[model samples]
Target: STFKSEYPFEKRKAESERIADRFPNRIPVICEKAEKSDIPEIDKRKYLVPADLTVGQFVYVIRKRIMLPPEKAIFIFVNDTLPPTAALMSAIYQEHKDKDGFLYVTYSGENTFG
Candidate 1:
């Protein structure tokens, strides 16, 4: 089952609100590994990040979580759109946060074998 289906609407809504209320300046975000991806999954997917944090910085956070190699490339998508690396979290948050109030992101990467 997928992340959304795993956490039903009620749970997601309440959790998002609780997290947002706890940190007004931070945005509540959830990340999931793409269904088709071969990359390692992150242990902790929920985060409360600063509004001004750039997408590139968030990318690095996910990168470290999975112990991704520097030579490998990672892709992050919001609402099926690949956001620009320099975009700010606040910007993405406003544009893509779900009806339940949490921002959702999906990640995947290219796999190469030699």
Candidate 2:
């Protein structure tokens, strides 16, 4: 039973390595939790993420950082708008990051998208 569960873990590691290989540099990211959200303050704010990370992949990382239960959902926005699936996070950071040089991402606790 435990062996079956380990594949998912191994797969994640392998996938992460592959993704990392595609982007040699990590991009700086800043995450802001909505005021009404339950995401902990300690988990809020800046991260150094892979430039090639897809929006969906980044969400998984955020979910892990905040220790959000698998039952919970998180919505992410870039420049106050939902980023497209193909959005290149490195380009987004280069274009939309704050003067402090961090790409700003706002996270909402609710399922804002219907």
Candidate 3:
């Protein structure tokens, strides 16, 4: 099915393709797990990931990177804001990334914060 566009179909298609080609580059982020949490077994501090990772997918990356136990739970907050969902990661990062270009994510084990 063809959807109508404000401009001619060919023009719209060209514009769409151009925008797709200009999509944001992958983001390199610093994932800082809270220091007070009790996981002494985990270390490595930074990750390179596509900017499009959903919050859930991002959690999966973190879980793998840190070798978090399956039975444990993790919580994340962006730039000290209220908790956000998987779908909101890109927007949050675009808005809150630090000057050095790292999107800072604060992670903690279950019940770490009220």
Give the Å shift of residue 106 in candidate 2.
1.5
Top-TM-score candidate index: 1
RMSD, candidate 2, Å: 12.2
**Can you rank all candidates by lDDT, best first?**
1, 2, 3
Error of 2 at 12 (Å): 33
Candidate 3's C-alpha runs over 4 A off are: 1-24, 111-113
Clashing pairs in 3: none
Model 2 lDDT tens row, 1-114: 222233464664554355456554887665777656776543446467877888778888788887888887677877767776577787677778654444668787764555
Off by over 4 Å in 2: 1-24, 40-44, 111-114
The better-scoring model by TM-score among 1 and 3 is: 1
Better of 2 and 3 by TM-score: 3
Residue by residue across 1-114, what tens digits does model 1's lDDT show? 466788889999998888878888989998888877788988888888888899999999889999999999898888878888999999999999999998999898952221
- Model 3 scores worst on lDDT over the 10 consecutive residues at 1-10
Q: On a 0 to 1 TM-score scale, where does candidate 2 land against the true structure?
A: 0.64
Per-residue alpha-carbon lDDT of candidate 3 for residues 1-114, written as tens digits (9 for 90 to 100): 112223465664454345336644666555676656765334655555676778788878788877887888787767666455546567766788765445667678844447
| Candidate 3 positional error at 69, Å | 1.9
* Whole-model alpha-carbon lDDT for candidate 2: 0.67
The alpha-carbon deviation from the true structure for residue 52 of candidate 1, after best TM-score superposition, in angstroms, is 1.2
* C-alpha lDDT score of every prediction, in listed order: 0.87, 0.67, 0.63
